Design a protein around this ligand. Structure first.
Ligand SMILES: [Zn+2]
Lengths: 105, 105
């Protein structure tokens, strides 16, 4: 509800494109490449990812496992994507505690 | 935020999923029947839905029976999302309207 930046934060793609993982050891990078862009996300080697070599990710989709910065999601995928993400992540917590409230609220 | 109008005159909506995706867990399972209730009970469909030899008109307040029916049509393989009028897409300024908001729970 305060839209804060998580600590163990996931990295998301800002563009649509295909995934290309390049790792010479001690460093790791995930490339999201398209006809118009080839952007490299260099990640800490310890961090675990969600994308196979050759996957098609859309803009805003997370590349790693953590929580998503709602401001980074705002820029990449727009406001309605942040709304749905916040609701789902909020409703996750109450569901893990057995509390049932409607999504409207 | 107060219910100010009977209808704000919008065609927008949100698609509430009926299936979840977990990485390492291939394919998409049904969402828990309670979570779907929290996402569908009382809400207004924005587009007409046809499934299991039956049709749900547009603008119908979804009773819990309709939610159970929509879950049956889901596990039959006939519906995967439900178009719904939600406050996220409501055009009522400084409030919501009677149809973008659903039941008085
Ligand atoms: Zn409205």
């Amino acid at each position: 509800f305060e839209a804060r930046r998580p600590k163990a934060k996931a990295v998301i793609s800002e563009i649509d494109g295909v995934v290309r993982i390049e790792e010479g050891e001690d460093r790791l990078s995930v490339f999201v490449e398209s006809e118009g862009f080839s952007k490299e996300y260099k990640l800490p080697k310890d961090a675990r990812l969600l994308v196979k070599d050759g996957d098609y990710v859309e803009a805003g989709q997370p590349l790693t496992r953590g929580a998503i910065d709602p401001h980074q999601l705002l820029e990449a995928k727009g406001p309605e994507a942040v709304e749905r993400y916040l609701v789902d992540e909020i409703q996750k917590v109450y569901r893990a505690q057995g509390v049932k409230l409607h999504d409207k609220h | 935020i107060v219910v100010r109008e009977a209808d704000c005159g919008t065609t927008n909506y949100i698609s509430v999923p009926l299936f979840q995706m977990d990485e390492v867990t291939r394919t998409l399972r049904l969402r828990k029947r309670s979570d779907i209730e929290s996402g569908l009970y009382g809400r207004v469909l924005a587009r007409e839905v046809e499934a299991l030899g039956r049709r749900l008109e547009e603008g119908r307040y979804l009773s819990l029976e309709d939610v159970h029916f929509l879950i049956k049509a889901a596990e039959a393989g006939e519906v995967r999302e439900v178009p719904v009028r939600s406050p996220l897409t409501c055009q009522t300024r400084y409030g919501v309207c009677q149809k973008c908001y659903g039941y008085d729970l």
